[PDB]
Amino acid sequence: EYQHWLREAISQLQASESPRRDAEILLEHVTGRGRTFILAFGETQLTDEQCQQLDALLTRRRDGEPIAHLTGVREFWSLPLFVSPATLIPRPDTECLVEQALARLPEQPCRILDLGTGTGAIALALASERPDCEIIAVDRMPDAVSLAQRNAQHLAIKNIHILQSDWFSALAGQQFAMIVSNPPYIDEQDPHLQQGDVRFEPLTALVAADSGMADIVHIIEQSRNALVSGGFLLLEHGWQQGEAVRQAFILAGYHDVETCRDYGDNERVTLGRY
Numbered sequence: 559e560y561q562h563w564l565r566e567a568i569s570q571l572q573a574s575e576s577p578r579r580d581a582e583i584l585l586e587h588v589t590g591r592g593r594t595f596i597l598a599f600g601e602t603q604l605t606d607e608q609c610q611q612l613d614a615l616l617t618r619r620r621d622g623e624p625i626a627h628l629t630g631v632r633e634f635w636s637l638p639l640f641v642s643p644a645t646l647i648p649r650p651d652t653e654c655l656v657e658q659a660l661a662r663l664p665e666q667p668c669r670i671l672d673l674g675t676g677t678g679a680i681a682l683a684l685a686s687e688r689p690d691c692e693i694i695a696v697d698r699m700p701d702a703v704s705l706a707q708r709n710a711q712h713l714a715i716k717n718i719h720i721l722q723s724d725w726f727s728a729l730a731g732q733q734f735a736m737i738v739s740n741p742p743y744i745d746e747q748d749p750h751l752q753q754g755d756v757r758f759e760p761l762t763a764l765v766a767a768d769s770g771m772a773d774i775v776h777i778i779e780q781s782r783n784a785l786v787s788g789g790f791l792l793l794e795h796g797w798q799q800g801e802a803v804r805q806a807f808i809l810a811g812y813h814d815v816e817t818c819r820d821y822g823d824n825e826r827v828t829l830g831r832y
């Protein structure tokens with residue numbers, strides 16, 4: 559049956575990450591039907607190579623290779639987003655960012671900018687709900703550039719342009735009332751750069767300069783000069799960069815600054831306007 563095969567795997571991934579879902583989605587793509595199916599019928603078998611291949615994808619994920627990598631796609635909170643080791647694997651915690659962005663977009667749609675887009679994750683989850691407005695993605699690493707461009711085309715969305723330039727580098731059309739961004743915010747020396755899934759993502763996609771504050775601070779200052787007037791700059795940052803990021807805005811910006819929590823652990827987004 560199916561299940562049988564699954565547990566053959568479960569015993570494997572036992573310590574690496576937390577097992578079952580891995581296999582499920584990992585085999586949910588193979589003859590890969592639905593997950594509700596597999597649950598309903600993990601009765602039904604699979605072709606041999608069909609199976610072996612998985613038997614092999616296992617070791618890959620065993621050492622530690624990201625599942626998403628192996629699958630090559632990721633359900634961002636809502637959508638199918640094709641991925642490629644050159645950008646970040648769209649984390650959920652980027653809930654705050656997209657939820658507050660929206661909790662503030664009804665107030666103001668048109669002309670928005672997703673900084674360091676990466677894959678199109680936010681820009682994309684943003685533009686779909688909001689075609690009334692336009693979305694702009696940018697990145698300084700060619701792969702992510704196209705990687706966004708790709709996903710952008712799959713779900714086939716409208717009026718969003720991705721680009722290759724340093725943050726504001728190629729930008730002059732700042733009449734954005736809303737800029738959003740999940741930049742690199744990790745300490746060059748952080749030991750978490752050493753744990754699990756992160757040993758596999760780009761230093762670029764992850765590393766910030768000062769203390770992990772360099773790019774944050776820099777888009778704040780640089781990005782706010784845009785003159786967005788009442789417009790917002792929303793940013794994602796590690797749990798422990800709240801106060802710093804908080805302060806950051808102030809020394810740099812104008813309106814009430816707010817640090818809103820993500821899911822459980824903490825503050826994961828900080829915003830304020832001009």
Ligand SMILES: Nc1ncnc2c1ncn2[C@@H]1O[C@H](CSCC[C@H](N)C(=O)O)[C@@H](O)[C@H]1O
Pocket residue numbers: 644645646647648649652673674675676677678679680696697698699702723724725726739740741742762763764
């Ligand atoms: N100096 C720079 N100028 C523009 N984009 C940059 C940049 N440095 C990094 N970036 C892009 O911004 C990304 C932040 S990682 C997260 C990407 C995306 N915002 C998402 O939430 O997944 C980096 O991976 C890189 O693709």
